[PDB]
Amino acid sequence: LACPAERSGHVAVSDGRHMFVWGGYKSNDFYLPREELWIYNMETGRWKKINTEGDVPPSMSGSCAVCVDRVLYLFGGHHSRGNTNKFYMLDSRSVLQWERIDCQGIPPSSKDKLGVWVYKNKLIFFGGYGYLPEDKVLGTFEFDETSFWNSSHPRGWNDHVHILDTETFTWSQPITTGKAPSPRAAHACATVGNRGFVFGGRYRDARMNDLHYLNLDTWEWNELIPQGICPVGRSWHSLTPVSSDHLFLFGGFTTDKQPLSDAWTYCISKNEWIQFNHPYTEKPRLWHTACASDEGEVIVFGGCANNLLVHHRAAHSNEILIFSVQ
Numbered sequence: 047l048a049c050p051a052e053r054s055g056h057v058a059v060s061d062g063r064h065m066f067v068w069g070g071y072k073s074n075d076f077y078l079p080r081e082e083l084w085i086y087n088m089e090t091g092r093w094k095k096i097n098t099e100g101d102v103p104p105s106m107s108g109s110c111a112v113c114v115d116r117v118l119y120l121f122g123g124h125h126s127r128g129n130t131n132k133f134y135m136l137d138s139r140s141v142l143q144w145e146r147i148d149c150q151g152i153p154p155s156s157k158d159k160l161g162v163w164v165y166k167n168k169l170i171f172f173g174g175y176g177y178l179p180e181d182k183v184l185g186t187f188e189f190d191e192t193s194f195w196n197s198s199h200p201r202g203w204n205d206h207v208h209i210l211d212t213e214t215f216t217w218s219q220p221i222t223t224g225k226a227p228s229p230r231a232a233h234a235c236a237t238v239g240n241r242g243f244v245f246g247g248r249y250r251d252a253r254m255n256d257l258h259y260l261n262l263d264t265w266e267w268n269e270l271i272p273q274g275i276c277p278v279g280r281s282w283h284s285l286t287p288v289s290s291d292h293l294f295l296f297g298g299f300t301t302d303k304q305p306l307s308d309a310w311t312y313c314i315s316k317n318e319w320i321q322f323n324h325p326y327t328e329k330p331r332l333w334h335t336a337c338a339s340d341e342g343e344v345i346v347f348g349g350c351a352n353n354l355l356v357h358h359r360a361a362h363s364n365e366i367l368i369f370s371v372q
């Protein structure tokens with residue numbers, strides 16, 4: 047049967063019925079073919095591979111993508127020659143053609159492993175890992191000292207918020223109030239209404255357990271302190287909105303390098319986490335993707351079952367894990 051190869055660090059976006067999968071890498075390391083676009087039909091469980099043309103982005107891991115009215119947008123990532131800040135569009139409504147957009151304004155620094163919130167005409171990007179910004183811009187950047195000893199170009203984490211306005215394809219940075227979360231990468235973002243949630247991620251020697259939201263109307267940051275038991279700190283997890291009041295969390299990697307198979311729901315109205323029982327306790331995943339379907343399910347694809355930092359033993363997956371959340 048038509049089935050995409052195993053991979054981690056790919057993107058997966060959806061319209062609630064079809065899930066589009068692109069990029070990523072695997073071992074036996076190499077990037078998956080840049081021209082392939084895999085489409086999973088969430089209702090039938092079948093895959094279809096299509097070959098794209100146009101301004102095909104380079105093969106990358108850690109890119110950040112969205113699907114808005116069946117138009118896919120892709121930002122950033124890491125290819126064979128490093129990080130990028132290029133922005134692409136792929137209209138999937140109707141051979142599919144990638145379009146690299148010449149954006150106006152100052153783009154974000156080249157980076158990967160970030161997150162995005164969609165709010166009306168705006169794509170709002172947050173955080174990531176990559177090069178030192180070419181100029182001192184709004185926000186903070188912290189170097190990863192380990193990147194000076196094993197590479198020609200040092201990298202670090204940022205807490206930057208950038209808006210790509212789809213009305214004009216212009217980059218800008220909002221002036222925020224409140225305490226932004228620390229710089230981080232491999233955090234997870236989820237949007238509900240005008241609230242852009244962000245949970246966890248890596249910063250310095252920690253994989254974090256903090257939860258915040260940015261008000262996408264006022265640009266005010268808020269820290270959420272749920273009472274009672276909270277999930278363990280992690281990076282490379284997924285956080286997916288499943289209703290107007292619930293975010294679904296799955297997998298990830300702890301500070302002490304444990305791959306995770308726990309799942310939880312964060313109830314926004316109660317400001318509480320509820321652990322979610324599921325049949326995949328023996329299928330931990332990190333750097334997988336998750337997409338919510340119109341039928342209340344969360345579809346998880348790819349990612350790695352163990353510590354992918356030991357490249358020769360990494361267990362990249364091509365499994366679809368289906369969570370019946372709502």
Ligand SMILES: CC[C@@H](C)c1cc2c(n(-c3ccc(=O)n(CC(=O)O)c3)c1=O)CN(C(=O)OCCOC)CC2
Pocket residue numbers: 107108124159175192230231232247248249253281282299354355
């Ligand atoms: C994109 C290539 C990928 C396989 C990759 C490889 C390596 C690293 N990151 C990174 C870089 C930044 C970052 O925030 N995270 C997320 C996270 O750590 O949760 C992973 C990669 O993303 C970071 N490293 C690392 O953590 O080494 C262990 C500690 O060393 C004292 C060193 C090898």
